[PDB]
């Protein structure tokens, strides 16, 4: 049974940097890419890391991504407001054939 | 400019079927690998469908058999047949772009769902 | 509560084709002997088509071979799929629960059936 | 040919006994179970009276249903306003496999 887990929720206030884990089984997230999506409010996810670690298209600087062994890292220097929004981590899980993707996190500012 | 707008949400009645549409500019559906992927409100993105290039289809485990993706010959655009509905099928459909099996790049703005009387 | 609500009923054109549903809740369609019955604005019940537990069918004269009658697997909701209609098919069709063959106990609301251009 | 024959209309007032009579040939009634149901203005039939003489599930009082021969008969003590609706005899011909109604009463109180 392989659906990788995220916290329900992850909140900071600003200047001060944010970390999101996305943990899984090693069937997908140990043997296939993670990537991260930010979803807005109302809106539609928008791609924000890719291929474990790149940046896309100058997404907004010091959002890092990072990848130890079966889990997955998003990182945002300081909680600025805007980047309030929903985080998703997806993977191709081949055992299932499928993308699979994790709880989401409820970003908040303090 | 790079854009997916789809079509056909609305309420419909539990069995019923629809024909949901995804139109593509900019880019060429019958290449690029398409994907259909819906999120209940309050809810996470489940992947429901891929085509790939040369035709083939993948399809989820709570999405198999009833539904189907198709990929016009001509209109630049794709389709989701979605037939025997329940209660679990109530949606916000998107169509991405996705880069091979890694990454999806681009979404469409969304097309509700409801099944309900 | 028992309740059975009807629904697919409106305007349509002579030799048209339309599936009315028949919606059971509190009771189970795949069991009580399920029928479907019609009336003509002033006009009197007619018997259209009964559903046995046993998958069996009965339709009447007039009703013969251009309609049928069928049973969800899963739904709880029955189907009457009308087709090749003409003038003396105009009704408020209802779906009734009949123990047995002896009387018709529940009585769902009732939709319009229309058959004009 | 089998179909139960009912008066197009019966009238009486407000404490006066109501009969209905419906009849038809031997084939359906003679042989199968007469049931009485009560249509209301703009709604849906309601059962009441079933299997010759029953009154089910506690429906108002006074109401009677008898069989004689090839004939049925509904008795209502009084003509109520309430009670105005049109009256249905349905039995199962058998020679037909049918469900056979009646003409229908147009019930009026004087």
Redesign the interface.
């Given at each position: 049974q392989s659906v990788l887990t995220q916290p329900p929720s992850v909140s900071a206030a600003p200047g001060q940097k944010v970390t999101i884990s996305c943990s899984g089984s090693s069937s997908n997230i140990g043997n296939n890419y993670v990537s991260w999506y930010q979803q807005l409010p109302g809106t539609a996810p928008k791609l924000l890391i890719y291929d474990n670690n790149k940046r896309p298209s100058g997404i907004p600087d010091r959002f890092s991504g990072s990848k130890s062994g079966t889990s997955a890292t998003l990182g945002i220097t300081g909680l600025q407001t805007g980047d309030e929004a929903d985080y998703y981590c997806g993977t191709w899980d081949s055992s299932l054939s499928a993308w699979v993707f994790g709880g989401g996190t409820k970003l908040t500012v303090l | 400019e790079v854009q997916l707008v789809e079509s056909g949400g609305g309420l419909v009645?539990?069995?019923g079927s629809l024909r949901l549409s995804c139109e593509a500019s900019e880019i060429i559906v019958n290449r690029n690998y398409m994907?259909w992927?819906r999120q209940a409100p309050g809810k996470?993105?489940?992947?429901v469908s891929?085509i790939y290039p040369g035709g083939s289809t993948?399809y989820?485990?709570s999405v198999k058999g009833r539904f189907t993706i198709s990929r016009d010959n001509s209109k630049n655009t794709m389709y989701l047949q979605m037939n025997s509905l329940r209660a679990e099928d109530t949606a916000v459909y998107?169509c991405?772009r996705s880069?091979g099996?890694?990454?999806?790049?681009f979404?469409?703005?969304?097309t509700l769902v409801t099944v309900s009387?």
């Open positions: - | 009645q539990p069995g994907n992927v996470g993105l489940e992947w891929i993948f989820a485990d998107y991405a880069y099996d890694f990454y999806v790049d979404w469409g703005q969304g009387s």
